Amino acid sequence: SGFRKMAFPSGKVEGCMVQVTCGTTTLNGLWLDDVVYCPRHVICTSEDMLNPNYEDLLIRKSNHNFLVQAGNVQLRVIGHSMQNCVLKLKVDTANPKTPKYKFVRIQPGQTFSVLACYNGSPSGVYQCAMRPNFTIKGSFLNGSCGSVGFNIDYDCVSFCYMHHMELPTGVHAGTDLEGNFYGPFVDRQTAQAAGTDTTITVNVLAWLYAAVINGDRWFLNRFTTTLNDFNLVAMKYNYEPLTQDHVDILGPLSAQTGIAVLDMCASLKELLQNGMNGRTILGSALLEDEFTPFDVVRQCSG
Amino acid sequence: GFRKMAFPSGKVEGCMVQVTCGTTTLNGLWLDDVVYCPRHVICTSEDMLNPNYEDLLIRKSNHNFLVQAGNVQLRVIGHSMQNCVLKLKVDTANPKTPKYKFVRIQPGQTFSVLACYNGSPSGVYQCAMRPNFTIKGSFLNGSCGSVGFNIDYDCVSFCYMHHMELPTGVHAGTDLEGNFYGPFVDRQTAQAAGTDTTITVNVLAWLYAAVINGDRWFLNRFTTTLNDFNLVAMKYNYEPLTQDHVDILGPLSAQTGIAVLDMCASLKELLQNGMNGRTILGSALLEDEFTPFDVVRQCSGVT
Ligand SMILES: *[C@@H](O)[C@H](C[C@@H]1CCNC1=O)NC(=O)[C@H](CC(C)C)NC(=O)OC[C@@H]1CCC(=O)N1C[C@H]1C[C@@H]2C=C[C@H]1C2
């Protein structure tokens, strides 16, 4: 208790959502400056989807085959190209609502806000974490493809995810805005499975730091560990190994609490090896792994 | 498959402004030519324990209120007070004003909160009005005047404006007519709420959402009467389930083929036996901040 999944305000992204239709297939696109970005599978029929030859499908398309609309207002397409698994449609109008933006490729464990959209119209916004197996636990229905994930820093929207597909287990897979899938997945209506997932250690550590900030610190011990020794133990409990970048992003919380990252790792190691022994942290017997260090600082300090 | 989802916040973002009086800054809501904000913006340290708001406000002038929309100051040309909300008339209409209404929500209903600081939106999340008229929010210093809302088609229904945090860490505020939800008062005192209870109809809605997403370990072959369920519910500090609630749950019952009173028998077993390590939709606790409409709207893709 005290913490909750908080999305970024979605208005700057709402002002970029359009719909893209090829034939009877409509999905969402992202309109930035004079380009619309969308999943390339908009060009597929039902039949093309098992083993689509995207290069051949696209060669048969022309600009005038793409219906791009902001609401019910058509946006004329003046060029088209494919970049990995995304289609880029050049349009004749620069989006007047284009925010300051960048395209970023996030790492597992990072969280982002999803603006779920259908027919170019936003339905809802929620926070997702990229799992270590490169899937997200979204809420996506038919027509949701092309919905995007993003973070906002100062005036700037960092787009990090575009939605493409649902796996058999009900989790979701997609690309960055350069069209490169997160994980090993491909945009084909074939049998694909996510890898066995693991716990996001860096975020559990952030959660333990949050607990300390809130005065809940019974699990702190007098010991430390090396990063390698911790990582070898963590893997035995299906926790992800830490990277150097993870150590770095815990820096601010380590400084705020005075607890060295490797000392907190030793405390987590003891929790893994001994369990909670009927105790709670921040009111729960379960350790949370979907709040990043940035999320904690956002909710603890503003 | 099922997530706590807020409404897209853009229509509300376009209405948020900063309001300053003295050394106090908070947020206001700019609709047409009026800015709505919490009246405690006019209080100082010497006033806040027992503020005679009518007396404090008559001593202020229009120019004591600094309203800023981004990098632009809005000239206040009049002011009035309605319960705990101040209404600052400005000389400029907001062209981003959405179609809107002001509503007062009932306990157990949900809404989205756009948390703002210094007139700038910072985050969006879904909340419920608790049975004890608090909200379990995430609000820091400077968040007052942040609003809660629902969206239907093109129309924003504003239902909450933020005023205060209680010692337990929950939150209290008003509707957009300035009337508090609950027994709280806009004075600088530690205030306790009445005993909270769990929103039973919402727990049932969420158990249906779990079944929809293929989670069904908690179902059983038994049933209960409505009254016998309610006796147990009350014992566990759960709200009573009314026949209207049963009716409201019909579409979810029809979808999953599980009678409402059969789901009540499952919930009764969970209350008496616990979850014993298991989780439902990733949660170790029974979740009560999804309404039946929220579950349906998210299983139907409404925009
Ligand atoms: C907005 O102006 C602000 C929002 C608060 C700030 C912290 N988190 C929020 O959501 N509202 C206030 O500061 C109000 C103003 C009152 C209504 C004139 N007061 C408020 O929220 O007070 C909260 C603090 C912290 C918890 C608590 O019990 N309490 C009350 C004060 C009064 C007594 C002295 C200090 C504590 C106890």
XYZ file of C-alpha atoms in Angstrom, chain B residues 1-295:
295
model
C -5.590 -9.626 -19.995
C -7.220 -7.228 -17.516
C -5.654 -4.022 -16.223
C -6.573 -1.055 -14.063
C -7.198 1.428 -16.829
C -7.689 5.172 -16.623
C -9.540 7.289 -19.140
C -7.364 9.186 -21.623
C -6.591 12.434 -19.850
C -6.038 14.860 -22.728
C -9.406 16.578 -22.520
C -8.697 17.392 -18.866
C -5.027 18.318 -19.376
C -6.163 21.185 -21.597
C -8.075 22.646 -18.658
C -5.395 22.634 -15.951
C -3.888 25.902 -14.736
C -1.852 27.130 -11.783
C -3.464 29.350 -9.121
C -1.426 31.286 -6.559
C -2.520 33.420 -3.609
C 0.179 34.668 -1.273
C 2.723 31.890 -0.822
C 0.198 29.119 -1.631
C 0.130 27.541 -5.092
C -2.223 24.820 -6.281
C -4.079 23.764 -9.431
C -7.250 25.099 -10.975
C -9.671 23.802 -13.601
C -10.290 26.285 -16.440
C -13.639 25.756 -18.204
C -14.952 28.497 -20.495
C -14.142 31.728 -18.610
C -14.066 30.325 -15.055
C -11.257 28.724 -13.030
C -12.368 26.392 -10.233
C -9.981 25.665 -7.379
C -9.957 24.770 -3.676
C -10.815 27.748 -1.540
C -8.082 26.970 1.010
C -5.646 28.650 -1.423
C -6.628 31.875 0.413
C -5.515 30.672 3.840
C -2.324 31.534 5.698
C -0.786 29.769 8.669
C -2.733 31.984 11.091
C -6.074 31.097 9.419
C -5.813 27.405 8.624
C -6.900 25.938 11.982
C -10.332 27.662 11.919
C -10.660 29.632 8.667
C -13.717 31.884 8.435
C -13.741 31.609 4.675
C -16.410 34.238 3.962
C -14.503 36.691 6.129
C -11.149 35.821 4.530
C -12.475 36.037 0.979
C -14.192 39.418 1.298
C -10.761 40.864 2.186
C -9.160 39.624 -1.065
C -9.073 41.472 -4.396
C -9.097 40.070 -7.920
C -5.394 40.952 -8.271
C -4.440 38.817 -5.254
C -5.082 35.747 -7.434
C -2.347 34.867 -9.932
C -3.593 32.407 -12.549
C -1.130 31.008 -15.095
C -1.933 28.839 -18.119
C 1.537 27.725 -19.126
C 3.634 30.819 -19.803
C 0.577 33.120 -19.901
C -1.116 34.944 -17.036
C -4.921 35.050 -17.023
C -6.500 38.207 -15.628
C -9.010 37.531 -12.860
C -11.997 39.876 -13.234
C -14.299 38.463 -10.564
C -14.544 35.773 -7.944
C -17.131 33.891 -5.937
C -17.222 30.966 -3.531
C -19.470 27.907 -3.768
C -19.070 25.698 -0.710
C -15.376 24.708 -0.617
C -14.554 25.758 -4.221
C -13.491 29.188 -5.437
C -14.652 30.281 -8.899
C -12.314 32.834 -10.488
C -13.792 34.583 -13.499
C -11.086 35.348 -16.045
C -11.195 37.600 -19.093
C -10.310 34.764 -21.510
C -12.268 31.656 -22.535
C -10.510 28.302 -22.745
C -10.835 27.069 -26.357
C -9.854 23.604 -25.143
C -12.924 23.356 -22.881
C -14.474 19.930 -23.556
C -18.113 19.081 -23.411
C -18.541 18.497 -19.699
C -20.808 18.088 -16.730
C -20.327 18.173 -12.976
C -21.596 15.071 -11.198
C -21.557 13.742 -7.673
C -20.535 10.106 -7.607
C -21.757 7.385 -5.283
C -19.536 5.249 -3.065
C -18.195 2.301 -5.002
C -18.056 4.156 -8.303
C -14.689 4.602 -9.986
C -13.080 7.541 -11.724
C -9.776 8.645 -13.192
C -7.540 11.130 -11.383
C -5.233 13.528 -13.226
C -2.653 14.392 -10.596
C -1.172 17.816 -11.249
C 1.489 20.049 -9.701
C 1.952 23.757 -10.474
C -0.790 23.486 -13.084
C 1.147 20.767 -14.924
C -0.286 17.244 -15.282
C 1.968 14.587 -13.769
C 0.109 11.258 -13.744
C -3.205 9.534 -14.341
C -4.698 6.606 -12.435
C -8.016 4.982 -11.557
C -9.571 5.404 -8.063
C -12.816 4.376 -6.365
C -14.933 6.448 -4.036
C -14.621 4.335 -0.899
C -17.705 3.522 1.186
C -16.275 5.802 3.886
C -15.944 8.601 1.286
C -12.171 8.653 1.157
C -10.106 7.847 -1.889
C -6.905 5.812 -1.861
C -4.978 8.230 -4.019
C -1.433 9.259 -4.766
C -1.198 12.974 -4.010
C 1.734 15.059 -2.749
C 2.121 18.672 -1.641
C 0.805 20.962 -4.367
C -1.675 18.426 -5.768
C -4.802 20.240 -4.553
C -7.159 21.153 -7.359
C -6.305 17.997 -9.264
C -9.565 16.510 -10.502
C -11.249 13.155 -10.945
C -13.449 12.392 -13.905
C -15.107 9.865 -16.199
C -15.538 10.182 -19.972
C -18.630 9.102 -21.891
C -18.333 9.533 -25.653
C -17.185 13.164 -25.976
C -18.319 14.326 -22.527
C -16.125 14.706 -19.437
C -18.022 14.196 -16.179
C -15.982 15.835 -13.404
C -16.704 14.265 -10.035
C -13.808 15.068 -7.688
C -11.476 17.897 -6.778
C -8.629 17.176 -4.402
C -8.282 18.984 -1.060
C -6.496 16.970 1.643
C -4.669 13.923 2.970
C -5.636 12.178 6.170
C -3.194 10.767 8.751
C -3.731 7.230 7.439
C -2.497 8.312 3.997
C -5.861 8.258 2.218
C -7.356 11.355 0.646
C -10.415 13.566 0.775
C -11.987 16.123 -1.477
C -15.127 17.590 -2.940
C -17.380 17.427 -5.939
C -17.218 20.362 -8.346
C -19.924 22.177 -6.398
C -17.448 22.203 -3.504
C -19.260 19.768 -1.221
C -16.993 17.264 0.494
C -17.430 13.580 0.103
C -17.556 12.394 3.691
C -17.373 14.101 7.060
C -14.228 16.075 6.297
C -13.564 19.800 6.613
C -11.089 22.138 4.847
C -9.224 23.102 8.017
C -5.639 22.133 8.868
C -6.404 19.348 11.338
C -5.772 15.604 11.549
C -9.058 13.999 10.533
C -10.063 10.355 10.731
C -12.589 8.655 8.476
C -15.303 6.236 9.419
C -14.625 2.523 9.178
C -14.128 1.499 5.592
C -15.723 -1.518 3.998
C -15.035 -3.487 0.846
C -17.125 -2.837 -2.279
C -18.713 -6.270 -2.745
C -20.283 -5.736 -6.175
C -16.877 -4.665 -7.482
C -15.112 -7.705 -6.032
C -17.682 -9.886 -7.787
C -17.148 -7.984 -11.048
C -13.411 -8.609 -10.764
C -13.888 -12.317 -10.037
C -15.876 -12.439 -13.287
C -13.011 -10.631 -15.029
C -10.701 -13.339 -13.692
C -12.894 -16.108 -15.117
C -13.026 -14.296 -18.468
C -9.217 -14.356 -18.461
C -9.166 -18.083 -17.703
C -8.586 -17.892 -13.926
C -11.073 -20.122 -12.109
C -9.370 -21.945 -9.223
C -11.693 -20.141 -6.750
C -15.011 -21.330 -8.245
C -17.057 -24.006 -6.493
C -20.101 -26.201 -7.076
C -22.215 -24.458 -4.432
C -24.649 -21.567 -4.258
C -26.038 -19.228 -1.605
C -29.080 -17.105 -1.067
C -28.683 -13.356 -1.321
C -29.491 -12.824 2.335
C -27.196 -15.570 3.613
C -24.417 -14.087 1.508
C -25.117 -10.624 2.894
C -24.977 -11.901 6.469
C -21.477 -13.233 5.853
C -20.460 -10.169 3.844
C -21.389 -7.833 6.691
C -19.489 -9.976 9.180
C -16.359 -9.464 7.053
C -16.941 -5.681 6.638
C -18.089 -6.063 3.046
C -20.921 -3.889 1.755
C -24.313 -5.529 1.242
C -25.180 -6.726 -2.227
C -28.538 -5.433 -3.442
C -30.804 -6.850 -6.109
C -29.780 -3.894 -8.283
C -26.180 -5.076 -7.955
C -27.246 -8.577 -8.967
C -29.048 -7.106 -12.001
C -26.005 -4.992 -12.892
C -23.876 -8.150 -12.842
C -26.216 -9.878 -15.310
C -24.165 -9.316 -18.470
C -21.045 -10.712 -16.817
C -23.092 -13.624 -15.467
C -24.532 -14.284 -18.916
C -21.105 -14.065 -20.543
C -19.399 -16.615 -18.269
C -22.414 -18.825 -17.533
C -21.930 -18.366 -13.791
C -24.983 -17.259 -11.839
C -24.411 -14.233 -9.643
C -25.317 -16.183 -6.515
C -22.881 -18.932 -7.529
C -20.119 -16.321 -7.698
C -21.318 -15.083 -4.299
C -20.782 -18.617 -2.982
C -17.241 -18.541 -4.386
C -16.589 -15.203 -2.702
C -18.029 -16.519 0.547
C -15.515 -19.386 0.406
C -12.672 -16.925 -0.212
C -13.736 -14.799 2.755
C -13.952 -17.762 5.136
C -10.969 -19.763 3.823
C -8.646 -17.120 2.402
C -6.669 -17.472 -0.791
C -4.021 -19.720 0.820
C -1.057 -18.528 -1.213
C -2.918 -18.465 -4.522
C -3.413 -15.238 -6.480
C -6.205 -13.909 -8.687
C -5.228 -11.807 -11.710
C -1.813 -11.418 -10.096
C -3.274 -10.057 -6.852
C -2.894 -11.664 -3.440
C -5.868 -9.590 -2.230
C -9.446 -9.294 -3.419
C -9.632 -6.196 -5.631
C -12.647 -3.900 -5.213
C -11.929 -0.886 -7.469
C -13.326 -2.253 -10.738
C -17.039 -1.720 -11.262
C -19.140 -4.047 -13.416
C -19.107 -1.366 -16.128
C -15.301 -1.108 -15.931
C -14.966 -4.857 -16.478
